[PDB]
Design a protein around this ligand. Sequence first.
Ligand SMILES: [Ca+2]
Lengths: 98, 125
Amino acid sequence: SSGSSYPSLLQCLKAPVLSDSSCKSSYPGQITGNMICVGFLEGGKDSCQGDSGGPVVCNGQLQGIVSWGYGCAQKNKPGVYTKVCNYVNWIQQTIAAN
Amino acid sequence: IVGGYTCAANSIPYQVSLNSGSHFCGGSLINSQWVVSAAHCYKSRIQVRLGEHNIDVLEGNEQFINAAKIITHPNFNGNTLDNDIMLIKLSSPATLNSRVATVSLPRSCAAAGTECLISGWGNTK
Ligand SMILES: [Ca+2]
């Protein structure tokens, strides 16, 4: 159930992976190697609260997990996503043993 | 999702809603028993809702399955959200069909500029 603020219907957004340098420049001191920025430096289009945990899928492959950002859809503050191509071995080994 | 569009119903069949009375987070189905999500979405009990489009209305394609295991990445940092990843084991396997399906894990990292699809039931303003 969507409660007080969330939409009832699943929402979709097309957005590009951003360079690591743009991601670090947007969030100085806060980006690790396990994070990627996806979205628009001009703002206006982004994920937001309630989206965390959900997918970023590129060419049929899960590359990001909705994680955090400053505000939503703010200028020079694109969404920050967990970088899934760092974790395939953690995922496969955890599934294999549990 | 701010500035997006409404997905066609069940066109994102790997998208799940994590529910503890109401929707609070998303996730992605990666095999019939496992959902990957974010570690800061951790709760001691989670119901996984698959096959959803309208999360407020029963439409007929839903599967509601409670989590049996919830495993956060051991090096998750709650202050910085580093290693923000979590795996949820379903207490029974989801039935895979045309509206409930898995998404592939990556064979390499995506290049800057690659177009991707992001989805969810998060705030739209
Ligand atoms: Ca529904």
